[PDB]
Amino acid sequence: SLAHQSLIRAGLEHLTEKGYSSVGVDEILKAARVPKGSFYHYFRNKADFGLALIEAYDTYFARLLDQAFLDGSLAPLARLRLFTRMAEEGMARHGFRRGCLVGNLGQEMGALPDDFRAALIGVLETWQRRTAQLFREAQACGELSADHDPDALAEAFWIGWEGAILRAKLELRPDPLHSFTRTFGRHFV
Amino acid sequence: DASLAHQSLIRAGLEHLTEKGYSSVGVDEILKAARVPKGSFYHYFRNKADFGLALIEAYDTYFARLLDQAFLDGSLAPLARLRLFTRMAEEGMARHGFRRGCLVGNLGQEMGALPDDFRAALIGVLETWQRRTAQLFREAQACGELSADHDPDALAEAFWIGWEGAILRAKLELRPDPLHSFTRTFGRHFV
């Protein structure tokens, strides 16, 4: 019933907090409280579980961006600030111990299976396209000046935001999120 | 080569942890790459954790020398010294096909799986880099390159937050594009 969901849940908690290299199937089963036979009913092996976890994180995180980026009661820049504020509230729930599954996996790329590279890049690119669209909308109402490139700016936002999450999880506090967003915010009029 | 055992260990450590990370790399893999016996490893280090801290101290020392080349070059304006550093760091990364990143960024990201000693050691190195960079930015203000408007410490912190994330992305994509993308956009903060 809840065998599959408990495995996904256990996987997302362990990979946002530690990363893939640190965690084996046995840790996962203890945390999920699910028999080994259920693990192998859903996934062929650890690498295949890893990919399922990437995909599940992408589906969840898309709903988070829906909530912020599609809130038409908010001017476009205020949507970006709602996003970073909500992302920080989510981190504060577990005292900043848990970061981004994608940034964690991204940093370990050298020890991951090759399949992972294109799946991680696809997810980062989906987010950048969405942020670029938000930034074009900020230009249309003069929140961001015409001499900026929305795509370049979207790529820089995600580069720095993952860097901010790395630092917040290292320091176990929100201050790096605030530094990043306060300085990046100066690209706007 | 018996007299080379310590450098071999550090070398193999730096190579393997900049390419993979701490959680991925066991002592046996280090020994096999260093071609030194186990008794030589334990002569110098009490365990993997003591080794890892020694690698951070080694990386701090060698990295400080690369910053010295850029940040202490008096033939360059302050902001040109910052562009030199990023150019150099990219050249370094390009030598090994962008497969090797920052040791401090790699370990920082896997902090949840590390002995708690590492936290202060990793944060210490980053704060050093940030202090050198803010000083660079204060000199950029004192000569008109940066507007009196900006906080040099906040900007130094935002630089190191963003640069570690650009390196992450360059090692993931195996290309310098995220580096150029980051610095191109960050360069707008300057006059």
Swiss-Prot record, chain A:
It comes from Cereibacter sphaeroides (strain ATCC 17023 / DSM 158 / JCM 6121 / CCUG 31486 / LMG 2827 / NBRC 12203 / NCIMB 8253 / ATH 2.4.1.). Signal peptide: none annotated. Keywords: DNA-binding, Repressor, Transcription, Transcription regulation. InterPro entries: Homeodomain-like_sf, HTH_TetR, Tet_transcr_reg_TetR-rel_C_sf, TetR_C. Induction: Strongly induced by acrylate, the operon product (20-fold), and dimethylsulfoniopropionate, the operon substrate (DMSP, 10-fold). Part of the acuR-acuI-dddL operon. This is Transcriptional regulator AcuR. Residues 1-61 form the HTH tetR-type domain. Disruption phenotype: Loss of repression of its operon. It holds the Pfam family TetR_C_13. A transcriptional repressor for its operon. Probably binds to 2 operator sequences in the promoter. Residues 24-43 bind DNA. GO terms for molecular function: DNA binding. It comes from the Bacteria.
Swiss-Prot record, chain B:
Coiled coil: none annotated. The keyword Metal-binding does not apply. It holds the Pfam family TetR_N. Keywords: DNA-binding, Repressor, Transcription, Transcription regulation. Residues 26-45 bind DNA. Disruption phenotype: Loss of repression of its operon. GO terms for molecular function: DNA binding. InterPro entries: Homeodomain-like_sf, HTH_TetR, Tet_transcr_reg_TetR-rel_C_sf, TetR_C. Residues 3-63 form the HTH tetR-type domain. Induction: Strongly induced by acrylate, the operon product (20-fold), and dimethylsulfoniopropionate, the operon substrate (DMSP, 10-fold). Part of the acuR-acuI-dddL operon. SUPFAM superfamilies: Homeodomain-like, Tetracyclin repressor-like, C-terminal domain. A transcriptional repressor for its operon. Probably binds to 2 operator sequences in the promoter. This is Transcriptional regulator AcuR. The lineage of its organism: Bacteria, Pseudomonadati, Pseudomonadota, Alphaproteobacteria, Rhodobacterales.
